[PDB]
Specification:
Blueprint (H helix, E strand, L loop, with lengths): L2 E6 L2 H8 L9 E6 L7 E6 L1 H4 L9 H7 L4 E4 L2 H16 L5 E5 L2 E5 L8 H18 L3 E6 L2 H11 L4 E3 L2 H10 L10 H8 L8 H4 L2 H8 L1 H11 L14 E12 L2 H19 L6 E8 L4 E7 L6 H18 L4 E9 L3
Parallel strand pairs: 2-4, 7-8
Antiparallel strand pairs: 1-6, 1-7, 2-3, 5-6, 9-12, 10-11, 10-12
The structure holds 2'-deoxyguanosine-5'-triphosphate and calcium ion (3 copies).
The structure holds a DNA duplex (14 and 17 nucleotides).
Length: 341
DNA sequence: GGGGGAAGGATTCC
DNA sequence: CACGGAATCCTTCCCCC
């Protein structure tokens, strides 16, 4: 089995660049302005010119300007990036039917029944990078190996604008020398939990007693890490289907006042319903980011679809249920619709 | 003992 | 200061064969 993984470079910023080539070369930071104050917000992402100086995704815009006061700060435009992604995903289908669209900017292609080895795969990769650059003008990174996880790491290592082949031999080197925290799915919190067990490489998970591992990071993670370490991990390329759609917005100021929170919640419901596109959800969740940046939610599943009118009415009750069970002030509020009909 | 679902929380960035 | 979207997993609670 041969898996090919494509991941677009600094995608959002790169898109802003394609839509305005004069940006090429300058540091570009795509931002999400909350509207709390002049420059309040966070960095969506930034091109490498800016990333080399510490401006990455997540930090406050304000902190970005303290580092690169003269970089180009553009507001984030999801819709556009969304349509640019789609177009690219379509070129990929022109290489395989078995394709899993993992996110807005990466996909796994099953090319096992279309190539005979890795040198011929390395070739199909260069082919794809070129077809994407020529058509949409976007540079991507390609990762190639036996399963999805290893293909992603290959990419992770070749970024940016690269292509790497992690073959069966190297898979052996990696399971030994690979830093466990560099494995897709191991975040800082799962990364630290594994330290307390003295696990620094995939191989270490083999020598610890399952029930202990299983009781430190949960059954799923554990079996996942083990199969990888044992070289017997091999999940298939699945055609993913959206199971959720929603929107969360930030308010001008924290509050626990129902009437001054509703407007944000209703707008979230409107943009939400517009994106459903013919789809009818049976479950709705009201999500709230409290003041100490802690997330809370309250949902309801219906035996039928939810009309926009029932959405408005029901979300208000769930918000009320939130302000009643939680004493904290609310910073961000939104809605999420699921269990589509 | 345990299927199956729903709900609220936790974690990754896949 | 610290935005935003969505998948997957964990745990407790329920209902009940
Ligand atoms: N709003 C927001 N968007 C994010 C965040 N992180 C990632 N994104 C979006 C914008 C990125 O362009 C897009 C693709 O994410 P990637 O992890 O692949 O990062 P990117 O492609 O930007 O750089 P990369 O070449 O992969 O190192 O995901 C975030 O924290 N907030
Ligand atoms: Ca990317
Ligand atoms: Ca990506
Ligand atoms: Ca990591």
């Amino acid at each position: 089995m041969i898996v090919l993984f494509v991941d677009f470079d600094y995608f959002y910023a790169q898109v802003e660049e394609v839509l305005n080539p004069s940006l090429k070369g300058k540091p570009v930071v795509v931002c999400v302005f909350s509207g709390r104050f002049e420059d309040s917000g966070a960095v969506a992402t930034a091109n490498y010119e800016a990333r080399k100086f510490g401006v990455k995704a997540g930090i406050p815009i304000v902190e970005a300007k303290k580092i690169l006061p003269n970089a180009v700060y553009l507001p984030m435009r999801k819709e556009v990036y969304q349509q640019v992604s789609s177009r690219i995903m379509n070129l990929l289908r022109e290489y395989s039917e078995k394709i899993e669209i993992a996110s807005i900017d990466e996909a796994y292609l099953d090319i096992s029944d279309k190539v005979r080895d890795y040198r011929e795969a390395y070739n199909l990769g260069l082919e794809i990078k070129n077809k994407i650059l020529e058509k949409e003008k976007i540079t991507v990174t390609v990762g190639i190996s036996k399963n999805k996880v290893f293909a992603k790491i290959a990419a992770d290592m070749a970024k940016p604008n690269g292509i790497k082949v992690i073959d069966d031999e190297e898979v052996k080197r990696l399971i030994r020398e690979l830093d466990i925290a560099d494995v897709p799915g191991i975040g800082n919190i799962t990364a630290e939990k594994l330290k307390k067990l003295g696990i620094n490489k995939l191989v270490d998970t083999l020598s610890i007693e399952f029930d202990k591992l299983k009781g430190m990071i949960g059954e799923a993670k554990a079996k996942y890490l083990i199969s990888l370490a044992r070289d017997e991990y091999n999940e298939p390329i699945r055609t993913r289907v959206r199971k959720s759609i929603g929107r969360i917005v930030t308010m001008k100021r924290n509050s626990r006042n129902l009437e001054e929170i509703k407007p944000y919640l209703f707008r979230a419901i409107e943009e939400s319903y517009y994106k459903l596109d013919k789809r009818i959800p049976k479950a709705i969740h009201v999500v709230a980011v409290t003041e100490d940046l802690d997330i809370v939610s309250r949902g309801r599943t219906f035996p039928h679809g939810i009309s926009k009118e029932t959405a408005y009415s029901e979300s208000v009750k769930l918000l009320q249920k939130i302000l009643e069970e939680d004493e904290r002030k609310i910073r961000r509020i939104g809605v999420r619709f699921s269990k589509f009909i």
